[PDB]
Structure formats: C-alpha cells, structure tokens
Symmetry: C3
Amino acid sequence: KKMSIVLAPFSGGQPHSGVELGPDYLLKQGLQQDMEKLGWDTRLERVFDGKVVEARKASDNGDRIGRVKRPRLTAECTEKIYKCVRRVAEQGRFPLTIGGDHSIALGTVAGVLSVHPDAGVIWVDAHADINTMSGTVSGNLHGCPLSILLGLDRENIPECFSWVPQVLKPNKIAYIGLRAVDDEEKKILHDLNIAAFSMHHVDRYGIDKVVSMAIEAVSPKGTEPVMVSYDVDTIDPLYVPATGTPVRGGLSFREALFLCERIAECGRLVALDVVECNPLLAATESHVNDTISVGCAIARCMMGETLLYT
Amino acid sequence: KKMSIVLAPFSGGQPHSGVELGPDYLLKQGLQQDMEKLGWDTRLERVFDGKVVEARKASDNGDRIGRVKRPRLTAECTEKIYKCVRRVAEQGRFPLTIGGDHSIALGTVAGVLSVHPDAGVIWVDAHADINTMSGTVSGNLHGCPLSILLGLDRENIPECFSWVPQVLKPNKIAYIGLRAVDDEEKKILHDLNIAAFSMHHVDRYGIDKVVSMAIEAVSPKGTEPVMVSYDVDTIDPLYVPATGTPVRGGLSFREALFLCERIAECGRLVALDVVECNPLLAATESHVNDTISVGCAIARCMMGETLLYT
Amino acid sequence: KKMSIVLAPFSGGQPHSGVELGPDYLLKQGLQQDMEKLGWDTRLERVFDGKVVEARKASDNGDRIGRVKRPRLTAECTEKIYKCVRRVAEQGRFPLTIGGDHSIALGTVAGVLSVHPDAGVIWVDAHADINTMSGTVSGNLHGCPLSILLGLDRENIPECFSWVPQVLKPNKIAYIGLRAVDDEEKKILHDLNIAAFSMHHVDRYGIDKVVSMAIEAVSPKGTEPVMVSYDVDTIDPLYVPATGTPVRGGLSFREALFLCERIAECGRLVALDVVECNPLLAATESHVNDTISVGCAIARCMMGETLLYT
Ligand SMILES: [Mn+2]
Ligand SMILES: [Mn+2]
Ligand SMILES: [Mn+2]
Ligand SMILES: [Mn+2]
Ligand SMILES: [Mn+2]
Ligand SMILES: [Mn+2]
C-alpha cells in the first residue's frame, strides 16, 4: 500500500484564481493523515510552485491561440504532472492527484495510462470536458482535456501539446453525473459512442446501477485497472458551493460518497484525481469547509473508508 | 411542431396577489425562445388583461356564494381560457398554458379534452385540488378544479359554471406527488377509485416507476393522448419557494425534471399547464429566480430538452 | 387503542442542556391531540420533574466513575422510566416515550422487552450507541445504552445499573441509518453479528428495502412484536438541526417518515421512543420548529397517519 499524493496547484485551465489552493487546503484538513490512517504509506509530490505559476499566469495575457487561453502555460504545467504521475505509477505507487482545475487530467490520465495501458477512466463530472480547440467557446482548457487526450481536432491542437501520448480510446471513458453538456459535446459523445451516464440515468436507475454500468463499460475482460478523475462540481452546489462552474441538480452528498465506496469495493482503482476545489469562491468560511471536507471525504471513501466493519 | 403559449394571468382561485405575474416572469426568462429553440413554431395567446382582472378582483368582495370565493370572476375568466385552449387545439397546435393559479385548469382540461376526448390527465401536485363546493373550507377555487370538472356535488356548483363541459371521467386522472390531501378529498379519491400516487409511492417505488404507473393508469389502449397540469408546489419548497401553498417533503429538483423527461419520452403529451408561480411570495430575488427558472425548466424538459444527444 | 405518552425529560446521558425540553415542546405542538385524533385513548405519564433533575445534574460534577459521566443520576432516572414503561405495557397500553437523550432507552427497551420478551428492536440512529463503559471515550451515557442492555463489559458496569434486566439479545437488534460508528463499535457489531443497515445500504438498496430487511432481521417467526427507538439525529441536519450530535449525510425528511409508514403498515409496532430533540440547540426559532415538528411527524406516521385514504 504505497501512495504518492500528487500536488497540482494549477489554475491555468480556467479564469478564476483560488482553485490552485485546493492541494494546500486539502492537506490542511489532514488528507495525508487520513491516508496513512487508512494504511497507506504516503509521500507528497510537489510538481511545481503554485505561487510562481499564478504569478506568470496572471500577468501573461498574450498566452493565447485564437479562442484557446493559456495553451503554453497549460501545456508546460500538465507535462510536469504527466512526468510526475508517470513516475509515481512506474514505481508501483498509487497516484492521488489533488487539483487544481480539471486541465490537470491531461497529465494524470496520460501518466496513468502510459503505465497501465488498459486502464479504464471514469470521469465524474457535471460536464463532458471534451470541447475541441475549434469548438471551445470560452477557450478555457479545463473544459478541453478529453478532446486533447482522445486526439480530437488534431490539426488544431497547438504543437506545445505534442508531448501528449495518444493512449486514451473512447471505449475506455465513462461519464457519471452529466447535466451541462453543450451541443458540440453532445454530438461527440454520440458519434464516438462514449459511455455517458447523465443525472437522468442516476434518477432513473439509481447511483448503484449507474456505477456498475460505468465500471463495466470500460472493463471488457472485467479485470482492467480503473482510474477516476473526480470533478467536485458533479455534486450539487448545495453541498459543494465553492467551485468555478456550479450546475444545479447534482449528486447528493450521499451519492457522491456512495459512488466512491462502490469503486473502492471494486478493488481495481489504480489512480484518482480530485479537482475543482476553489476556496476563494465561497461566501461564508462555511462554504469552504463544506467543499474541502467533501474533497477529503472522497479521498477517504475512494481509498478504503467504510461506515461499518471491514 | 406548432405551439400556442397560452397566457393565463389569473389569481381569482386564491387569496394571494402575484401569481398572475407568472406568465410575464416566465416569458421574461425566455420561455418562447426556449420553445422556438426546441423546434416549435410558437405563438403567444393572451386571453385577458391581468392588470384589469386583478383590479376587478381586488375590489369586489361581494363575489361569493357561501364558502366559495369569486365564483363569478373565476367562471368568467376560466371560460375564456377554455375557449382559447379549445381553439388552439382545434387548429392542431400544442397548448402550453402558463398560470396563474390552478383554477385555470378548468379551462385547460375542458379545452383539451373537448378536442381529444380520450386524453388522459396527469395532475402533478402536492394537493388533490378536488374539494367540492360544499366541502371546500377555505372557499379558494384553485383547490376545486377537479371537483367541477368531474361534475361532483353537481347540485351546489353555481350556474355560472354551466359552460363547463362534462368531459373528464375519474379513470382518466392520475395524481403524482400527493402529500397534503384533506379528509374529504381522501374519501373522494377512494370512492371514485382515482389513480393517485403520493410521495409515499415515490419514496417506495422511485419516480421512474411512479410515472410509468401514472401514464398507464390513464392510457387503456396505451395509445391515448396525455395532458399534464403541473402545479409547481409539487416540488419541495427548498427548490420552489415562491408559491402560495408550500408543503414540505416534495419532489427534488431532479425528480421534478426527470418526470418531465419521461413524459416527453412518452411521445403522446398533447398539452401542458405550468401553474402556481407567485414571484411576489419570495424573500430574496433569488427565491424568485429559483422558482421561475424551475418553471421554464419544466417547459423545456416537457417539450424535448435532454441532457444528452437526441 | 390505548396509549400512554411517557414523558422522559432527561439529559444526564450527555453534556448539553435543552434536550429535556423535548417532551414539553412536543406536547406543545399538539402531540397528544394528534394521537387522540388518530384514534388513540391517550394518557400522559410523567416519570419525574425535569426541572429538579436538571438542578441535581448541573451541580453534581462528582457523579462519575472514571470516564463514565453521571452513572448514578442516569441509573436512577432510567430505572424510573423502566418501571413506568413496564407498567404501561403490562396494562396493555402502547408506550410512546418522548425524550430526553437516548440514555432513556435503558428503561424503555428494558420495560417493553420484560413484557414482550420476543420483541424486536429497530434502532434508528446515525450512531450505534453501543460504546462499552471501558470503551466510551467521552463517557456520555446516551452513547452507551445498548452495551448495558446487551450486558457487555459486564465487569465494568457500575452496580447502580444492577436493576437492568438482561432481556435484549444481539439477534433482536437492527440498526437503520448508521454513519458515525467508531472503531470499538464497528468491532462489536461485527463480532456480535448485529444486523446493521448504514446509510450505505439505504443509498444502495433504498429505504423501502432496508426497512424490510430490518423488520425481518429481528422477526424470526415473522410475527414478533416490534419496538422502535428513534434518534432524530438519524435524519440529515438539513431537516433536523436542533440536536446534540449531528452527522452529515442522513435520511431525507421523506425517508425519515416513509420508514415510519412502513413500520406502521407492518402492524406489529408495540412501542416507540423519539429522542434527542434539543430546542436550545438552534439558531433561528425556525430550526426549533423544523426539529420538533419532525418529531410529532414521526409519532403521527408511526401511529397511523397516511397521506391517502385508509
Ligand atoms: Mn471537469
Ligand atoms: Mn465540471
Ligand atoms: Mn394545484
Ligand atoms: Mn398544489
Ligand atoms: Mn442515539
Ligand atoms: Mn445518534
């Protein structure tokens, strides 16, 4: 039980500052203690200085390629995460990455899949995060990771992303909690036949059935490793207020953690990303605690925490 | 895909002013744009001036027949809605009526059923709205539409309602979300064997099963048209605060819209009423937005909006 | 249909004052009227003066035996409740006990089981309340009733509890809503094979299935009497704010009452405790009303109240 808590305080995939504080806030609530307490030999892995990056990000408005914003900064930072997550996995340790916005998944998914080539990816998010370079309206890269990972709109992806390995295939991605998918993304999921479970399926079949369906979808031989990239805005704003792109009608606090228990129960989780926690996006310091604690709760539940004896 | 958005700014079936602002508020949030955006050729249908009606209503306290309040005003306005909804349906257009309190269902149901005689009616409400003239304690007519439509307590229904066609039979009504039914109404539903699904059934079988049961109940040949009269107070006050008769323990925001998706999916929806939105019954202008947006959301989901590709 | 509303204004099993006001507050909201209105011939049973007890409790800090706090006061008061609940049951009347903290279950369970020896016990709580004398860290007895009732850690239970009859066996206890069980309690439930249904099971199977499983677990011949000890903190703080030990991720208001309806439906409920309502633990006098009304709602639903005709 070896684990490497990968700290990825990045905010370049979006406009709001504060999300890069997630790592720090999570570790403050005792993330590592919880993990050690769960029997994991933990080690912190800092990939870069969040303060420096915020500095170079804030200033440089010239970092753009048409609609896409900060492709240079994003490509540079996510490549460091890739190298760190790749290394962590090669050493045989479990990489738990704390963001930071979802653009970091470029490095996490790339890193994990380049080591566990047949690993399935369960993307827990209210959004599809699959906007192509030409398609993205806002130009925020935290909503484009999967397009770049799947190598979509090839011709328009900046060369500064030439380092991204083409290891993710559409039949190895499964979404859970979708409810804010735009027209371009709807067509993509449909044309690529990507297993996507919206809030409609949750409401229709219940979270237990949805998780089972999601794990099956990316697990042919039913024995492949599984990775989860958890965007906290999948959970209803009621419980997860401090976040950049909230969307009403999400998972209840209970469903958010039950999902984790089912994956833990699975026994094949090989990696986990917990992203989009922006403490600076809350009114009361209570919203901040509700949010960050939910993060630590996801980590604990994913890594073994059960309500009863085990 | 022809639609007529019937504007019914009426508040005579109850005591609180503000509910007649629903139409205006809904159209402000872009109700018609959403509908056109969903592929419907829309047309607004104003049946009467909400300002004038509020004026004649406010003043005239003499409009009463024992317990029943404003039977003259209510009978006159609902007859105009009947004629408008009847006309809209005859032209082969889909009538989407925005209230206004639920007393307007006297005209909507009468209008739709006089054109589609075998149309089933799914009444989404926390209340049964079936108090008889002699039975109604409060005398508010927004809680009596179904008694008059079913022709109950015949002998005591004012003659100013003589225009109401006897087109609704008890085996063509199905309730969803019931939780505030009074003793008289409990006996009625039971003696008339009306298919009623309370929050108990939702909690017991889940919203998916309940909707299926409701659609079946009013669809013998399983091919009859279906009409939905949606009272927003069916949804828990948590999400729908600005409303005249709130009742704790309602449908979650998710269930409120999933229900709509299932009906849309059905393919036989022939009419829809969205009622009881009172913007003037909110503390923060946030309660107002939560409420009105939920209204537009019901319309979009009922009329075709899906979370994924379709 | 004879009932005895047992008033147990006790707070000695915990540190916060205010919980002893539950009885008074409940009766204020009309608890007895509701019961009579439900067809029960009610009678109030005061076992002791809540004001006097609070007085002797507040002062006496010397009432302790190591970690355990107020074992003398608790043992004395719970013995009075035992005698009262035992008497009420012998007279063939239904004992509805209103607390007061959960330490009162020492007398209720003992009283009911000494009359209905084969009665099952359904403990609705977020906590296991089974800490042993040596195990309890906080020393608060409202978290130790079941250990004493099951006669655990015998050797360390003060002799002032020598009156407690050994009538409860582990195969006659079933938990519902568990989510804050400590390590000692986890081991105990596991070693004793006690039927426990955590929020995990509720999220996984739904409340309907869980209740059925719980009733089955303590009902071998499927015809045994059933008793329910209802701790209100089983319900999510969102709905039940004013309480001593809140825990996030609980039963929704709907599940809290549906559970009651299923037990009522069962037809074998022989006793009910409603505990942990502390009015003095609320910010707005709204939290207080939300909480206390939920209490009366549990009593009504348990005792027969249905949403539709019956
Ligand atoms: Mn995301
Ligand atoms: Mn997202
Ligand atoms: Mn209504
Ligand atoms: Mn209603
Ligand atoms: Mn308890
Ligand atoms: Mn408890």
